[PDB]
Amino acid sequence: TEKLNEIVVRKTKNVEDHVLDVIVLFNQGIDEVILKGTGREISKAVDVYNSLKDRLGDGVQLVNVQTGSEVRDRRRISYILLRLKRVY
Amino acid sequence: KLNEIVVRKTKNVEDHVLDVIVLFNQGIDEVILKGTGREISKAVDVYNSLKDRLGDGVQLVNVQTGSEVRDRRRISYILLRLKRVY
Ligand SMILES: [Zn+2]
Known part of the structure; x- marks a missing residue:
């Protein structure tokens, strides 16, 4: 169900690294x-x-842009999904 | 301007709701x-x-996401356009 190439924005990697x-x-x-x-x-x-x-x-x-709420640890935490397409 | 809610750092989530x-x-x-x-x-x-x-x-x-300039610095923003549905 959760296929594609998804990248989870980590708290330990800076923004530029993710970019x-x-x-x-x-x-x-x-x-x-x-x-x-x-x-x-x-x-x-x-x-x-x-x-x-x-x-x-x-x-x-x-x-x-897709926003929702999931499970995670023990309580419902919010999430966002930004789908990007490289265009030529 | 009159129907826009700016989420503040000092107010809790429920307060904005x-x-x-x-x-x-x-x-x-x-x-x-x-x-x-x-x-x-x-x-x-x-x-x-x-x-x-x-x-x-x-x-x-x-949902609109992008960047704006505040105090000669770039800052990200998000906008959620909500419809009452009555
Ligand atoms: Zn990296």
């Missing part, structure tokens, strides 16, 4: 990537997208 | 929920809370 990681995928032909952010990292996921958008401009498109 | 319901009860069809920086997470928290309370009674039209 560079996504472009590494884009460059090898993996044109669609999913950024996932849960809890406080939801803000970070948007930060990653913005940084990606600043350096790729018209070259990347935010296909859609 | 109530601010929306108050507008909905006031007969307002749509409300804009905005969060910038660290509060982007909270804005989504407010939505999931609103949905948990009103459920089918509320609908998210669209």
Whole structure:
């Protein structure tokens, strides 16, 4: 069910690292990537997208945004999914 | 401007949810929920809370994410356009 190339925005990797990681995928032909952010990292996921958008401009498109609530530890935590497509 | 809710750092999630319901009860069809920086997470928290309370009674039209300039610095924002559904 949870296929594709999803990248979970980590609290331990900085924003620029995530941005560079996504472009590494884009460059090898993996044109669609999913950024996932849960809890406080939801803000970070948007930060990653913005940084990606600043350096790729018209070259990347935010296909859609999906927000929800999951399980995780013990209580319902919020999450966001930013689906990105590299465009030429 | 009058139907937009800026998520604040010093107010809890539930407080913002109530601010929306108050507008909905006031007969307002749509409300804009905005969060910038660290509060982007909270804005989504407010939505999931609103949905948990009103459920089918509320609908998210669209989500706008991007960056704006505040104090000569770039900051991220998220916008959740909500429809009352009455
Ligand atoms: Zn990395």
